[PDB]
Amino acid sequence: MLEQPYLDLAKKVLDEGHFKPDRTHTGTYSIFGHQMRFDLSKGFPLLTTKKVPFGLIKSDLLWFLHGDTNIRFLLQHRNHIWDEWAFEKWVKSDEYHGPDMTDFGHRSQKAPEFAAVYHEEMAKFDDRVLHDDAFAAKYGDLGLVYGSQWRAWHTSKGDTIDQLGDVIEQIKTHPYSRRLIVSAWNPEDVPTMALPPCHTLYQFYVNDGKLSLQLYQRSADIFLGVPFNIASYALLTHLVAHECGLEVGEFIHTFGDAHLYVNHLDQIKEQLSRTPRPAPTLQLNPDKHDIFDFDMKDIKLLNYDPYPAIKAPVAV
Amino acid sequence: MLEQPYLDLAKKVLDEGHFKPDRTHTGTYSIFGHQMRFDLSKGFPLLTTKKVPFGLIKSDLLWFLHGDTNIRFLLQHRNHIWDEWAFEKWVKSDEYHGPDMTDFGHRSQKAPEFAAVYHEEMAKFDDRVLHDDAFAAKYGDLGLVYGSQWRAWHTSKGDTIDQLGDVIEQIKTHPYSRRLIVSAWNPEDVPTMALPPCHTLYQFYVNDGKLSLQLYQRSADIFLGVPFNIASYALLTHLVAHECGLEVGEFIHTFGDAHLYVNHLDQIKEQLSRTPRPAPTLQLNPDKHDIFDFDMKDIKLLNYDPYPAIKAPVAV
Numbered sequence: 001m002l003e004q005p006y007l008d009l010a011k012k013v014l015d016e017g018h019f020k021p022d023r024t025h026t027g028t029y030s031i032f033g034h035q036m037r038f039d040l041s042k043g044f045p046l047l048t049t050k051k052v053p054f055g056l057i058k059s060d061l062l063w064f065l066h067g068d069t070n071i072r073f074l075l076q077h078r079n080h081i082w083d084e085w086a087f088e089k090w091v092k093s094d095e096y097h098g099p100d101m102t103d104f105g106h107r108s109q110k111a112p113e114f115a116a117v118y119h120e121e122m123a124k125f126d127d128r129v130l131h132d133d134a135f136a137a138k139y140g141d142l143g144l145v146y147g148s149q150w151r152a153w154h155t156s157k158g159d160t161i162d163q164l165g166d167v168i169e170q171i172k173t174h175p176y177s178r179r180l181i182v183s184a185w186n187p188e189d190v191p192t193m194a195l196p197p198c199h200t201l202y203q204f205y206v207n208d209g210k211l212s213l214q215l216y217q218r219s220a221d222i223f224l225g226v227p228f229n230i231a232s233y234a235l236l237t238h239l240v241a242h243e244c245g246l247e248v249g250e251f252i253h254t255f256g257d258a259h260l261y262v263n264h265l266d267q268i269k270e271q272l273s274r275t276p277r278p279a280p281t282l283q284l285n286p287d288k289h290d291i292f293d294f295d296m297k298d299i300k301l302l303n304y305d306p307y308p309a310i311k312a313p314v315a316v
Numbered sequence: 317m318l319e320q321p322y323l324d325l326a327k328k329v330l331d332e333g334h335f336k337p338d339r340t341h342t343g344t345y346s347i348f349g350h351q352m353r354f355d356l357s358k359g360f361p362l363l364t365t366k367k368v369p370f371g372l373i374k375s376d377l378l379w380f381l382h383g384d385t386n387i388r389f390l391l392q393h394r395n396h397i398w399d400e401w402a403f404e405k406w407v408k409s410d411e412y413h414g415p416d417m418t419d420f421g422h423r424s425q426k427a428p429e430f431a432a433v434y435h436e437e438m439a440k441f442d443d444r445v446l447h448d449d450a451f452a453a454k455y456g457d458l459g460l461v462y463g464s465q466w467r468a469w470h471t472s473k474g475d476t477i478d479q480l481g482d483v484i485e486q487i488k489t490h491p492y493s494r495r496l497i498v499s500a501w502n503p504e505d506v507p508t509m510a511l512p513p514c515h516t517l518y519q520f521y522v523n524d525g526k527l528s529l530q531l532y533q534r535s536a537d538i539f540l541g542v543p544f545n546i547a548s549y550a551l552l553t554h555l556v557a558h559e560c561g562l563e564v565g566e567f568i569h570t571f572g573d574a575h576l577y578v579n580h581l582d583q584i585k586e587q588l589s590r591t592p593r594p595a596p597t598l599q600l601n602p603d604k605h606d607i608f609d610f611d612m613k614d615i616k617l618l619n620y621d622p623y624p625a626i627k628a629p630v631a632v
């Protein structure tokens with residue numbers, strides 16, 4: 001069924017993860033080196049065994065495809081994956097005139113009063129952001145995130161390159177290139193960096209009329225992180241093909257450190273008792289074409305029937 | 317036996333390679349997406365079924381480890397993998413005052429007189445290079461190759477970063493980082509580039525006392541190219557560990573386009589009738605330690621017993 005390589009990747013960490021400690025002094029059961037693949041013409045690998053919400057992956061990926069490094073598009077779009085790292089800057093910079101909040105994040109889902117106050121100090125931030133444009137401009141621009149990694153690779157000769165888009169022209173004009181790669185690792189910057197990016201690299205390959213893509217993820221959270229990343233790069237692979245008049249083929253997902261967090265071995269075991277239901281389909285509306293012009297109405301999903309959702313402490 | 321994942325990767329392309337055309341209008345039987353691994357503590361995966369020469373991998377890798385972009389070290393070292401791309405520049409630039417040579421490469425192993433003349437026009441180049449230092453400086457410096465990709469990532473703020481070395485300090489000081497990655501893809505430059513590099517990215521990971529490394533190769537030649545690349549990154553993995561007082565673990569080799577060239581399906585079939593003999597061992601001399609200080613005497617191999625060598629037309 002399309003998501004069996006996933007439960008199968010979860011199994012195996014449990015069963016041969018050696019403990020790795022990590023940045024956030026929680027635990028990881030870990031493996032290194034895993035590649036798995038999904039045939040995107042049999043369905044769409046949004047998991048059926050654990051609800052994952054696709055409106056959230058859609059606003060999210062699309063932000064990247066527009067060049068955008070600003071959370072306004074996101075809040076407008078009811079999205080907040082990204083919320084907390086702009087907040088982070090705010091809550092320091094001279095204007096944070098208010099209260100506790102510095103740290104939030106932990107003292108939040110393990111205490112004190114921080115649950116409430118803080119969620120409000122965030123919201124207020126988010127409401128100033130969604131209108132006070134001078135603010136939005138200086139505290140909601142995350143600067144270096146996938147959208148400008150992909151479309152404005154700051155050169156060394158004062159300019160911006162549009163890797164992804166550049167790459168999409170090589171697909172049209174010579175689709176058999178062994179080198180369609182978009183990178184999102186900049187060695188100048190990962191020192192000064194907040195989360196240096198996961199999906200380090202990707203490559204497309206066309207053959208027999210089908211596009212395929214391979215992702216390399218330097219670090220992966222089997223419970224919380226991977227459910228959603230498999231869907232960002234499958235949607236990207238559907239997206240790039242419908243623009244080049246290409247028929248879809250498969251997504252391959254490689255992983256350096258793949259790991260399960262210690263506070264997740266119960267919750268994982270819960271989905272593991274489940275049975276895959278048939279995977280949904282996608283419909284990507286035919287008329288429109290500059291992929292940079294897709295907008296959330298243009299990507300619709302059919303027949304998604306998942307098992308109810310599971311909860312996790314974020315561990316970090 | 318240690319190299320069975322290799323014959324096994326060769327098999328499978330033959331048997332499910334769909335034809336891909338390529339830059340050099342020869343053919344490829346191709347697959348996309350393959351990951352394979354080698355446990356570096358059972359032996360050293362220098363193939364036993366096809367002689368591969370390790371003095372050539374040694375001078376070669378070591379050049380990279382010194383920062384070096386100059387062929388002098390190589391010619392001194394009897395190496396010439398690299399020869400022909402500096403030649404390439406020579407044979408144009410105003411001073412090429414002499415003859416035919418422009419193209420060489422094809423009219424060479426398929427005609428005319430080009431076999432001889434040209435091999436001499438190369439040598440002469442190589443003898444001017446190995447003494448006339450002003451020349452060596454301007455026609456034997458390849459500029460952007462692994463040695464400066466890894467140790468002088470030209471920043472955008474006029475300077476040089478030493479990725480590899482930088483990364484080797486994070487191994488000592490926090491060996492459990494999910495992010496020890498050295499990249500060798502620069503989006504500014506792959507436009508203006510000769511062979512944009514293959515081994516796009518690599519990552520280390522230590523755990524239980526062992527270092528491991530994963531390579532991502534955007535493009536791979538199963539007959540001619542991979543035999544030697546598996547040995548560059550295994551030697552690197554032995555090299556980085558003996559410097560951090562680390563015990564070795566395994567090498568993983570991922571591949572975007574893995575392919576077999578059409579002029580290679582006989583020669584491949586030849587090794588395929590063979591049987592692996594026990595894989596050799598390495599000895600990396602104990603006293604010395606700045607890995608940047610290893611020199612070819614310091615890395616010795618034990619008991620290498622291979623099947624005689626096989627010939628290939630280079631196809632490109």
Ligand SMILES: O=c1ccn([C@H]2C[C@H](O)[C@@H](COP(=O)(O)O)O2)c(=O)[nH]1
Nearest residue numbers: 023198219220221225226229494495
């Ligand atoms: O898109 C994402 C973002 C983060 N993570 C996970 C990976 C690690 O578990 C953690 C990042 O920690 P480092 O890998 O940066 O050390 O968050 C993912 O799985 N996918």
Ligand SMILES: O=c1ccn([C@H]2C[C@H](O)[C@@H](COP(=O)(O)O)O2)c(=O)[nH]1
Nearest residue numbers: 178179339514535536537541542545
């Ligand atoms: O270290 C190397 C260098 C080159 N190649 C092969 C890969 C391709 O067959 C060809 C390069 O062609 P492109 O991938 O650049 O198109 O040479 C390798 O296998 N390993």
